[PDB]
Design a protein around this ligand. Structure first.
Ligand SMILES: CCCCc1c(-c2ccc(C(=O)NS(=O)(=O)CC[Si](C)(C)C)cc2C(=O)N2CCc3ccccc3C2)c(CO)nn1-c1ccccc1
Length: 139
């Protein structure tokens, strides 16, 4: 149970409840990410909703859709905004999965997110002041 895993789970659990799904499977960091994710989704509502709906999620295409969006997202480098988009995207992927009755994808998307965070985002996060800097700038 890594810190990145706990962050992904708090974000996804929040997002699923915000979208009508009751449960399940720092607090300052978590609250900041919840708010930044809400702000991102409201800022790009229509285009964000079109992106996720247009993917047409299936247990077999979910990973490639995730990989393709994430890869394109961090093409020109990492920044706090794109990290917010990544959590938001993953969040939209989980709700979409529960909406379409493919709830088996929820913990799968959680793993792919925790893995991508640990492997390709943790260094940059540390080099750009850690999560405490994110709470200051976005929370
Ligand atoms: C899940 C959404 C990913 C969005 C994204 C960004 C990006 C990421 C962040 C932002 C952004 O606004 N960052 S910010 O720092 O200004 C956020 C500030 Si808030 C106070 C709202 C957290 C905009 C952009 C961006 O280029 N956008 C805005 C978001 C959006 C949503 C749906 C479709 C297109 C766009 C265009 C990029 C560029 O890397 N590529 N992509 C992308 C990748 C694959 C397919 C389609 C689009």
């Amino acid at each position: 149970s890594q810190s990145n895993r706990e962050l992904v789970v708090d974000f996804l659990s929040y997002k699923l409840s915000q979208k009508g799904y009751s449960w399940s499977q720092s607090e300052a960091v978590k609250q900041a990410l919840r708010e930044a994710g809400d702000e991102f989704e409201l800022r790009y509502r229509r285009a964000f909703s079109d992106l996720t709906s247009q993917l047409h999620i299936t247990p077999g295409t979910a990973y490639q859709s995730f990989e393709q969006v994430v890869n394109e997202l961090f093409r020109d480098g990492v920044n706090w905004g794109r990290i917010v988009a990544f959590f938001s995207f993953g969040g939209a992927l989980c709700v979409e999965s529960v909406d379409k009755e493919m709830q088996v994808l929820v913990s799968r998307i959680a793993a792919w997110m925790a893995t991508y965070l640990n492997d390709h985002l943790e260094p940059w996060i540390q080099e750009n002041g850690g999560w405490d800097t994110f709470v200051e700038l976005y929370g």
